[PDB]
Design a protein around this nucleic acid. Structure first.
Ligand code: MG
Ligand code: MG
Ligand code: MG
Ligand code: MG
Ligand code: MG
Ligand code: MG
Ligand code: MG
Ligand code: MG
Ligand code: MG
Ligand code: MG
Ligand code: MG
Ligand code: MG
Ligand code: MG
Ligand code: MG
Ligand code: MG
Ligand code: MG
Ligand code: MG
Ligand code: MG
Ligand code: MG
Ligand code: MG
Ligand code: MG
Ligand code: MG
Ligand code: MG
Ligand code: MG
Ligand code: MG
Ligand code: MG
Ligand code: MG
Ligand code: MG
Ligand code: MG
Ligand code: MG
Ligand code: MG
Ligand code: MG
Ligand code: MG
Ligand code: MG
Ligand code: MG
Lengths: 98, 68, 223, 43, 102
RNA sequence: GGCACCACCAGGAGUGGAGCCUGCGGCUUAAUUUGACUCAACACGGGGAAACUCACCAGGUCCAGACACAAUAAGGAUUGACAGAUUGAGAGCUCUUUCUUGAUUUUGUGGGUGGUGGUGCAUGGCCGUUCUUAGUUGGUGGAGUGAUUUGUCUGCUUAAUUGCGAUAACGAACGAGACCUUAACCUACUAAAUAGUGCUGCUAGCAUUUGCUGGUAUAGUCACUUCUUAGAGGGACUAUCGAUUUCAAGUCGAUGGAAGUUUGAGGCAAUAACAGGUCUGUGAUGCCCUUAGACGUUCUGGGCCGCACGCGCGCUACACUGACGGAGCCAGCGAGUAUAAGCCUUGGCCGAGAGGUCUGGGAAAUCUUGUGAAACUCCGUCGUGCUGGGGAUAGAGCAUUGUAAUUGUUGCUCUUCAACGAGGAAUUCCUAGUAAGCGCAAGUCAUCAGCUUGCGUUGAUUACGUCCCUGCCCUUUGUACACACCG
């Protein structure tokens, strides 16, 4: 897929810091309402990430549920050239409740 | 037809062998008695059981009945 | 926005139906039984019942935290407006959903059907079920497909009580040669029911004879 | 299980699976730096 | 903004919890000397959907007839606004939704 | 032997005969996509297709071919592109044309991925059918070496293997019945300004007797729950009395009753089974096929409607128990929206109509709505005549929906005014608020309902019996069948 580097970037800082992404299955949608780029870009950009074992993908009721692997946090640790302060938000150890 | 079933026929004749002195020939009195004697899940079965018990009671006074 | 009463109660049901299937697909490996949506002021409490509440609440509750985020981003909910709790099912043997998912994880491991089928027959009865019947249909090495029923104990079939004391779960099992369909019908004991009727409609319980006392002619006991 | 065997060893092997699990399961119950800040500290 | 004529609208699919919440509010509006009007049983609405049984189009023409009963009750209270809202939290039920209109 | 209006008897309405609607075969076709062929294929795939739907046909785009490699590659791997040509097209599709972007990406290898592509005779699930008929099963005991058998039956009775009863059986389970939903009763409870009423304020018209019809009334800060709504209950259990009967299960009459056909109607529904139908419901599937000149997907246009014919579900009718023309004027089941992508729409004003316009109400017991529906009833015209029955076919014209109406979407106006004068052999549905008419609402739906799913208005004739036909069940029997006569 041909994604501009800048638009692919916004796709990467949404799949990090809130390391889960939800995308409705419509390829011609102008705006996925949470990543200011084409909706098709979001699907195909994360299809590569799940293709390279960085996100699990689940599909239910014409909707994509993307979740970031622990191995994928390390990939964005280096490729994004970001500080080594990790834990996007769903990994911040907010701890459950009993 | 109005053929009573086995769940009402056998359950009614157990009452007579167990509570004959308290029973009577009146359906209305019998209907109230069986609500405190048996645990019936539905109101319709309660009247059905008492209505056949009354028939058996009405038949016992004319002679001996089979199964009681 | 402004939604009619007819269209609002349906939306809550449709939301439940879509949310329930989402857990079945995602938490299939953890014996997902069901979900309860407890609406409350300033919060949307969601109670999920699974055999294993460690797979959902694993590695400092990372998965459940990363799983509630997938629902805020799909239903446009406020991040504080929803709270998810994972609760263990008390009687795992009485849940046909847990028993059907457990059977699939065994059938997919190559275990023989007879050993797998009898593993849920005895597990259901051990938990105290009144009856259980398991049907497995599909193809196994043979080109022709077949179905086998494994009953046990007492089972009711017709009328309303089947909607009250019986829960059912069907799942499709993905095999290398096709699809295996399993049906797990479990009838719970009506005496333990805590919300509906506590007995079958035709169960008549006659009390015992309180008679056989001795009557004395005619005294008066004063107080 | 189309044999007189492997269903014999399906029940005795199947039932010992449950007996091991009811007791195991009845024991299981009786004994019961952030990120967005790093994106704003560019002052 | 003190004592007002206040409407609470109760809608749900199941009547047992609806009458418990309805009776519980009436109970709390009795020991508290608050004049009340209700509950008013609105005519229940039967949402019916009739589909074909066959996923395909083969067999006898057999139909399912699904139903979704909606029961709606409105209760009128004469109390200050602070009192009525806290009553709602006393009688909160997952099945029944509540809307309050002045 | 037994049961059954998907069987018959007595009958009712019919269909088959006509025109037209629609489905099927056939023919035709550039394609007229396809499944289904007795019941259990043929107004069925919720399949009422202008585009989409769409799978077909004639053409035109895109990759939305992830990923590991290898090649190429900054001295630029590649993407977008004005203008002209080309094209159906203001598709940079392609061709002249040099601009722009920059390692996302181009080629080969593997690997994918997507298919309304094939296989429902490889499968899951679902559904239909045997069959909603009344059938099925185990414990102990008896018989047998055994597989098995009795129990599960001569008779009566029931809607019913449902009961009485006979009894090497006794006592039980599933199914049936129980159960659940709905309709009919409650002046007995609980309340209701989103329901109704009497009074009461204020107020109108007509005769004046103080009466009779109304409007108004969300402050009359009234009264009440019969009508309306719905929750807790009550109420029918064949109750009482006559007959028959093995005096048993029951059945038929009366009386009371709201209800005495399981009170009426449904929902659920056993043990197994079918090569029944669906991979054209599924991001349900195994395998096969295809995968860049696609069988993916998209755009444009056509087709699914195409017409010498056979068949099925239906709608109008053939008139006077009627057509028109005025007038009277009564239901129930339901549905309804927002920054949309536009819902139900009263009321006012235009218009012969269809329809248009301006406001307002309603996310609804509040408004549309008492949905003032149609049959129906009254009074007239017509007068047995292919007539004022019938309204195809067609010409000209007016509106609506939609990007788009041509192969007329639908509606309206004038005109043309066809077969049909009650239908052969055959054949369907049906027993009481039933059949038949008669409309209305919901589903499909931008538009289109001669279709279904329901609802109510008017409302019968004739049995309440049988095995004569037909189908199914049971018992006995024969068997060289057991993949079970498709043997
Ligand atoms: Mg039963
Ligand atoms: Mg039943
Ligand atoms: Mg006939
Ligand atoms: Mg006849
Ligand atoms: Mg006709
Ligand atoms: Mg088309
Ligand atoms: Mg097209
Ligand atoms: Mg075609
Ligand atoms: Mg295709
Ligand atoms: Mg099948
Ligand atoms: Mg035996
Ligand atoms: Mg024996
Ligand atoms: Mg039986
Ligand atoms: Mg039963
Ligand atoms: Mg008022
Ligand atoms: Mg007045
Ligand atoms: Mg009934
Ligand atoms: Mg088949
Ligand atoms: Mg076949
Ligand atoms: Mg398919
Ligand atoms: Mg498919
Ligand atoms: Mg579909
Ligand atoms: Mg193509
Ligand atoms: Mg067609
Ligand atoms: Mg044509
Ligand atoms: Mg039909
Ligand atoms: Mg007239
Ligand atoms: Mg109204
Ligand atoms: Mg005409
Ligand atoms: Mg004429
Ligand atoms: Mg016939
Ligand atoms: Mg059309
Ligand atoms: Mg319609
Ligand atoms: Mg149709
Ligand atoms: Mg033989």
């Amino acid at each position: 897929m041909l994604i501009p580097k800048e638009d692919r970037k916004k796709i990467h800082q949404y799949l990090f810091q809130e390391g889960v992404v939800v995308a409705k299955k419509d390829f011609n949608q102008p705006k996925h309402d949470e990543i200011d780029t084409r909706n098709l870009f979001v699907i195909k950009a994360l299809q590569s990430l799940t293709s390279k074992g960085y996100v699990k993908t689940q599909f239910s009721w014409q909707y994509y549920y993307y979740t970031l692997t622990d191995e994928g946090v390390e990939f964005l640790r280096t490729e994004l050239n970001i500080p080594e302060g990790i834990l996007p938000l769903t990994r911040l150890k907010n701890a459950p409740a009993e | 037809g109005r053929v009573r079933t086995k769940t009402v026929k056998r359950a009614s004749k157990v009452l007579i062998e167990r509570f004959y002195p308290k029973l009577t020939l009146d359906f209305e009195t019998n209907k109230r008695l069986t609500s405190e004697i048996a645990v019936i899940q539905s109101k319709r079965l309660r009247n059905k059981i008492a209505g056949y018990t009354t028939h058996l009671m009405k038949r016992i006074q004319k002679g001996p009945v089979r199964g009681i | 926005a402004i939604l009619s009463k007819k269209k609002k109660l349906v939306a809550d049901g449709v939301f439940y139906a879509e949310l329930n299937e989402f857990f079945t697909r995602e938490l299939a490996e953890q014996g997902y039984a069901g979900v309860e949506v407890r609406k409350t002021p300033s919060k949307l409490e969601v109670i999920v019942k699974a055999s294993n509440t460690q797979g959902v609440l694993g590695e400092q509750g990372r998965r459940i935290h990363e799983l509630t985020s997938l629902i805020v981003k799909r239903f446009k909910l406020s991040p504080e407006g929803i709270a998810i709790y994972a609760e263990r099912v008390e009687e795992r043997g009485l849940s046909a959903a847990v028993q059907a998912e457990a059977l699939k994880a065994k059938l997919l491991s190559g275990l023989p059907i007879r050993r797998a089928a009898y593993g849920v027959l005895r597990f259901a009865m051990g938990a105290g079920a009144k009856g259980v019947e398991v049907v497995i249909s599909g193809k196994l090495r043979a080109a022709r497909a077949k179905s086998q029923k494994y009953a046990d104990g007492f089972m009711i079939h017709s009328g309303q009580p089947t909607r009250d004391f019986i829960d059912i779960a069907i799942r499709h099992v993905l095999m290398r040669q096709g699809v295996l369909g399993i049906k797990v019908k479990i009838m719970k004991d009506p005496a333990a029911n805590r919300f509906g009727p506590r007995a079958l409609p035709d169960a008549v319980k006659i009390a015992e004879a309180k008679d056989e006392d001795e009557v004395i002619p005619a005294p008066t006991v004063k107080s | 299980g189309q044999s007189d065997k492997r269903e014999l060893e399906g029940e005795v092997e199947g039932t010992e699976d449950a007996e091991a699990e009811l007791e195991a399961e009845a024991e299981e119950n009786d004994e019961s730096y952030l990120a967005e800040l790093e994106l704003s500290k560019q002052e | 903004q003190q004592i007002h004529k206040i409407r609470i609208t109760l809608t749900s699919t199941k009547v047992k919890q609806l009458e418990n919440v309805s009776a519980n509010i009436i109970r709390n509006a009795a020991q508290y000397n608050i004049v009340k009007k209700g509950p008013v049983r609105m005519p229940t609405k039967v949402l019916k959907i009739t589909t074909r049984k066959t996923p395909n189009g083969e067999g006898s023409k057999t139909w399912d007839a699904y139903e979704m009963r909606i029961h709606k009750r409105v209760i009128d209270l004469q109390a200050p606004a602070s009192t009525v809202k806290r009553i709602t939290q006393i009688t909160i039920e997952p099945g029944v939704d509540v809307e309050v209109t002045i």
